[PDB]
């Protein structure tokens, strides 16, 4: 019986809130024309006092980097390239990023694009 | 009965040689640490008047651009990293190539790396 990693590689607290951070090493992920593979980070909801995370990459990323993106991403706070919303923990929230995850290429809303939620479905 | 395209993509002359160019679209390939995905190309040894080439990258590439890869190639007559040979029509031979196929990050030949040999096979 060989075990298996399931579901969250952490769990953190930031800002007086909890988030569950999943990831995937996937290539699906958007490139430049150049030939820079991008990441996908996207944020849910809280639900039940946590906000759940999926970050989509190219590479294997361990827990102080995934970590990171929570923190990047809070203290950033970008705003949604098709509305102006920020993410209000109400709303799905995905951005695009590259140069090993500190430079946003995209960041939209699940009103402005719903497939998002999808996106981070298949692997919460 | 949908058809399928098999086989190589393109057949060119250059030099006064033949060069049958195969490809494939693929994600199992050499990176940079700043995110640069790179392509490999394998050079066969000429049999039957014919050189195989077999170019592995992470993006699809029309038949022009498999073309210039050739050209780039014949014209660069990069050296082994490992023994300092070129590419002589009687070993296989490998690049590492960023900066959609113009840069070679490494160049080496079989009797130095023989698994690249089982790379183009696969394809082949
Ligand atoms: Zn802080
Ligand atoms: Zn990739
Ligand atoms: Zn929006
Ligand atoms: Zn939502
Ligand atoms: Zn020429
Ligand atoms: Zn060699
Ligand atoms: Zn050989």
């Given at each position: 019986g060989a075990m298996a990693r399931v579901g969250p590689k952490i769990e953190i607290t930031h800002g007086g809130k909890k988030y569950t951070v999943f990831?995937?090493?996937t290539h699906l992920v958007p490139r430049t024309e150049n030939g820079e593979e991008a990441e996908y980070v996207v944020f849910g909801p809280e639900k039940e006092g946590v906000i759940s995370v999926v970050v989509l990459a190219p590479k294997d990323?361990?827990?102080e980097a995934l970590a990171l993106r929570v923190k990047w991403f809070n203290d950033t706070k970008p705003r949604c390239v098709k509305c102006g919303?920020?993410?209000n923990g109400k709303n799905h929230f995905r951005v695009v990023?590259?140069?090993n995850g500190t430079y946003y290429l995209d960041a939209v809303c699940d009103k402005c694009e719903p497939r998002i939620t999808w996106?981070?479905?298949i692997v919460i």
């Open positions: 990831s995937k090493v990323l361990n827990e919303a920020a993410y990023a590259i140069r996106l981070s479905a």
